[model samples]
Each structure stands twice: as structure tokens, then as C-alpha cells.
Target: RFLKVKNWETDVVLTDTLHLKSTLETGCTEHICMGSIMLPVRTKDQLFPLAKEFLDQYYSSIKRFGSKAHMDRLEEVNKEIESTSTYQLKDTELIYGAKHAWRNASRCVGRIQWSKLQVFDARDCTTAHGMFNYICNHVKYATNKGNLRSAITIFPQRTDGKHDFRVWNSQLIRYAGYKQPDGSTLGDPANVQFTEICIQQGWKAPRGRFDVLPLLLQANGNDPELFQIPPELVLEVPIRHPKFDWFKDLGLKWYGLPAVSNMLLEIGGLEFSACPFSGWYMGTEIGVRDYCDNSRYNILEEVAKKMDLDMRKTSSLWKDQALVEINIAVLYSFQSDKVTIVDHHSATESFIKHMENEYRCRGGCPADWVWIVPPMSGSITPVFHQEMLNYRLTPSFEYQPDPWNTHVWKG
Candidate 1:
């Protein structure tokens, strides 16, 4: 039986017709799903085969399969692996691999712009100072005065998966959360722990809402060093509603860049523990998840109160009314400032097109339905009801163990 889905906005119905087999194994059974689990690191014996497969895939992608250059490069990589147990990727290969990682990102709804990512190679960087410099450059380039180009700066790959370069922050740009005497969070609640870590590293907390946290950089498994991001490089947008003058009085603002700093970039069998990537944000990511999430900013009730919404009732739909206006403010504020931002409707529509293109080109596109669907407006969006299968794909981004959890720090 074929499952059908209808788009209420467009009044269009889509039917599932293809039952193609997936070449990749998700380790999922009929009664269990391991879609959210991380893939294990490849052993030395398994590494060469994975590398060879990736090489074949890469060569074929350039229409140079089995050419003399391809054969010679493969031989060179094999000899290097045999002798040293690992091999380095050529600069051109690194560029291709990075773009492929973004394209293969199963959780990203922004994959339509994957091929356009700017890959900044920092593989030669040997110091935390140098990493900070490269990161600052990345922030400036990607921010682009709020034009927001997608970019990634790749540091050295893990040699033995032990002496690895790492960025401790979850994101390159995030507000610090200060814990009060009464246990109230002053800034972004999501970053309280990291903020405390920064403070422990000798950073003085402004103890204010929306203070950007310093970059904590660790090179070659050494102790992390704290470096404040130059304020000029970090662009921010003040939130304001088109119709509601009171929204500006709320004094809400957010940084322009959404750069994920701590994910491992896996290409072939190589792991880069310090590949920081940035892209423009979707409207709801700020308005809904970051703002309305009870564990985060928890701004819903306050905003609702500002609108004189009835505090005692759920049937009043006050929260929903507040959420829509908050989203409107987010969209309006970013647009008015000429910063790049996508509303949920436009982003999901592009994602649908991207999925179609991927299927047409690669037979299947792996997706996590839970993550793909917007946090708010679930059913109204096209992706909410669409069935999806999630699986591991490399070259891809993978989450690594927290540096603090796995490594001993110098006191």
C-alpha cells in the first residue's frame, strides 16, 4: 500500500511510488531504529577499504575513473596508509570532501546551497592562536556584513583520534548564560555550562543578557586557550516588529551568524575534530526554538504578557498568537537589516526541491523526519507528514566526544 500526503497550503497530493533499496545500512530493524546513533570510527584494517571506496566515488564524480592520475593517486594513498596508518588528502580533494559533507548532511534543510560553501583549509595550523585567527577570518567571511555565506574552516585531522585539535564551543557565535544567585539564567540558557567553562578559563563575565562567549581553542590535545572574538567581526540584529513598536522596547537581539564549531568532519576514514561551519539561520530557529523553548530564553510568556494575552488559559490560543508575532518580528527584523534569513515556508519548499534533486541524482536521500520538520508549525509545513529514512553518509559531519569529558586539562 502506498502512503499519500497532501499539502494543505497548495492543495497538492503526493503519492509514494518508489520502493528503492538503500545501499547504506542504518543498523535499524523493523522494531528498532538507530537513526540518531553515531557511527563507530573505522579501524586501521577497515580504513583502507573505506578510503578506497571514497577515492573511487570521488574519481568517478570528476569523470576520471581509472585514469592514470586516479590510479597513481590511489596507489600513493595506499602506500601512505600502509606505512603510516593514515594518509592526508590533497587540497583539491579536501575541498570536494568538505562540500560533499555539507551535501550529505541529513539534518540540514539548507542543503540546496551545499555546493556553494567556501572551504577554508587550516590543516597546517599548529597553535591555538592560529586556530583563533582562522576562526575569526571564517566568522568575518561567512558573516559578510550579514549577507551570510556558508563556510567551513577545517583544522588538523585526528592522528590517533587522541591528539586532536578541538573547538570546545558548540557554536562559534552564541550568547553566554550567567547563572544568578537565585539560579536564574541571564542570557541564553543553552550556554550556561560553556559560559561557566569560559569563566573558569579567566574570562570575566559581563553578567548580562546576550554577551557573546569567547572562543576556547585546543590544538593537538593541549589545554584550551580562551580568545575573545573581536566585536567588529560579529554582526548582530536587533529584533523589531513591523507593526508593534513595543517589540523594540523589549530590547531583544541576536547575532547574525549560526556557526557550529564542535562537530567532527569525517571524510573517507579521516576525522577532523575541529571543523567549524556556518550558515544563515531560519526565522523559526531564533523565534521559536531559541526564544520560545522553555529551557532556553523562555520568552513566550513575557511576550504574551506584553500583548496582554490571558495568562491563565491555553484555550485562548495566546501562546500561538504570541509565537506568530515573534516569528514575524524575527523575519521583519532580519529583512529590514538586509541580513539573510529564511522563513519556515520558504526553507521547507526549497528542501522539498533538494530532496527531489537528490533522489533523481543519487537514488535516495537520507533524512531525519524529526529534525527536518520545523519545531513550530509542524503539520502546516510540507515536511511534517512526509516519511523519511535516516542513515549515516560520509564524507559527513559527525559529533565527537566533548573534549572536557575525554581529556585531562591542565590546572
Candidate 2:
């Protein structure tokens, strides 16, 4: 039987090749979809099988499947697991797995550039101070002065799903959000709670709109230690409109690196709880999501008022007008500063080509439609018209329980 679905809004028909069972549990139902929910941690009993399966996948990926070397490595891993209840990934394996994770990231539209990612293996790091050093190196190298490079710095994997090394910052570089006495936020409101945590950890609040947050590095399940990121290591672009002379006076700026620090990286059933990855920005991430989101900077009204758009009427498209101008400013600013950034149009177009390439090679490309579609002008983008399937893929980056929430800190 054929499973047919139609989107009335787009008038597009989708036909599915139905199967009785899926290899992965998608956490979805006929009536309700939980596509965006975080997956549960793998049980201890499931580890070896998953690891074996990943090794098979990995060897197959390298065209060495069923070879003597492959079989030998499998046996070696089995014995290591049997004796020590764990195994180590070779550095080459780590590098391959890191890039595979990026390629398998369902939510990222930048998977076209996945193979170019630089893997920084820091598995030997043992102290919070060491993490800060590795992180600084990652930031500096990924920043590349202005032309950003895609990179990941993986710290020690979780030993028995405990004694995890973690980076407390959601991002390697993010502005501090200060909650004012009158209930207004001075900076990025998304980071308000994190800012408070940093302050509670003895960081002095600078009370600026764009003060970079300090790093909170947790090593071997220890209480997190605060480390200030060196100012020189951070590259920021000051926002200015290409045509609007007054836009620069708005004092908007954003960091060059978009390094996510909190997500877990899973390869061969090994969980890296503190792997931070960085890449260049997709303009809408800084423009539409960061600047236009009401919970974020909430700059639309101000910009619209400055442009003398009729803000009282939604039909006047003042918000849309402001959004375009802001996005122009973001792309223009980053371009003028020579900091790498991709406009949503170009990013989505490339994603369509990526999907084509993926289907030709792998038969299926797991993608979360909600995330893959750009935030602004949703229906106008190519991804908005395309149907997608989101499923669990191994050697993937995943969300883990926040360290502070789950860990009992030893005083």
C-alpha cells in the first residue's frame, strides 16, 4: 500500500514507500509528531551492538568492509569491551566520525560543507584549565581572523555516562544578558539564565548590551570553573546597512563564530558530552532569529519607527520591511568585515542541491523540515516546498541533559 500525503497550502503531493518497521525509533505517531524531541540516552546493554553496527558502517564508508583489517579491529574492540567494558576510537576514526556527525545533523542546513570540517581531538585533556586552552585554540583557528572555518574540538568522552567533561556555555561566544531592575534585558535574553549562572559563579556583570559571557568549564564531573575568553580571540562584526546611513548608529554587532558547546557527540555508541563545534553563520540566524525575534533583541519596532514605517498597521508590512533591512545589514556587515556568512537564499539553494546529492548516494537524507527551513520568508524558500523525513542517525550530535541539572556537584 502507498502512503500518500498532501500539503494543501503548497498543493504538493508526497508518496511514501511504507514499511512495517523502521531501523530507528522516530518517536512519532500517526496522530502526533515528536520529531523535535531529544532522544533518550542509549542503555548500557545496547552499547556494544550499536558500536559494532557503527564500526561496520564506518568500515563500509571507507570501502574496507569485510577486509581482514576491519575484522581485526572489530575483534580488538570486542575484546577491549569485554575486558575493560569500554574501548577507544582511533584518531582517524574520531576525525571521520566527527565529520559524519555533521553530515548527519538533521537540523543543520549547512551539511553541504560537512566534509570540510576540521576535527580537533582533545580526548587527553584532564583539567578544566586544559579545556579552556583547547577551546581558545578552537575559537582562534575556526575564526581564522575573518574567514571562518568549520571545526569541532572534542573533549573526553563520558566514562560510564558519568564523570563527563562539559562546556557550560550554550555557545563558545555569546553575549551576556543582564536582567535589569525594571524587568528589561540588557543583552541577549535567550542567555539570561546562563548570564545569572556566570554571575553567581563570581563573574562581574559588565552591564553592557553585548558583553561576551565567560566560559564555564567542567572537567571529570567536577564543579565548573569560570574562564574569561581572551578578547583578542573573539572576532566581531559591527552591523551596518549597505544603503541606510543611520543603521550603523543602532550599535548592533555579532560574533564571528557560531560554535555550539553544549550538545553531546555520539560516535560508535561513545558519548562525547563536551564536544564544541563551530562554523560560519547563516545570515537569518543572526538577522531574523537573533535580531527580530521578540524574545531576543526585539529591534523590529525600533527599526520600523526609525524608517518611519506605519507601525500601527500589520498590513502595511512594516515588520517585513524592517526584517529585510536588518538582514541586509547583517549580511553587509559580515561581508564588509570579511567574516564568513551565508545569506538564507544561497544557503537554502545549496541545501536543495545537497538533498539531491544525498539521495543519489545514500538513498535517504534525514532532515527536520522545521529547522531546515529558514525562519524568514518560509514558503519562499525551496526547502519549504520539499517533503523531508527526520530519523535518528548514528555518529550524530545530540542534546544531553544540562550538566548543572543532572550533576550533584561535590562541594
User: What are the Cα lDDT values of the candidates?
Assistant: 0.87, 0.87
Give stretches of model 2 more than 4 Å off: 1-22, 36-44
Question: 196, model 1: CA deviation in Å?
Answer: 0.7
Question: Cα deviation of 44 in candidate 2 (Å)?
Answer: 5.6
- Per-residue CA lDDT of model 2 for 1-411, tens digit only, reads 544434445565554442221255677889888866646334547778877888898898899999999999999988887777778999989999999889888899999999999999999999999999999999999999998899999999887655889999999999999889999989999999999999999999898999999999999889999999999999999999988999999999999899999999989888999999999999999999999998999999989998999998899999999999999999999999888999999998899778767765776567789789999998888788887877667788888777778977787
Measured on C-alpha atoms, candidate 1 has an lDDT of 0.87
Q: Encode model 1's per-residue lDDT on 264-318: one tens digit a residue.
A: 9988789999999999999999999899989999889889999999879799999
Q: Kindly give the stretch of ten consecutive residues in candidate 1 with the minimal lDDT sum.
A: 15-24
Best prediction by TM-score: 2
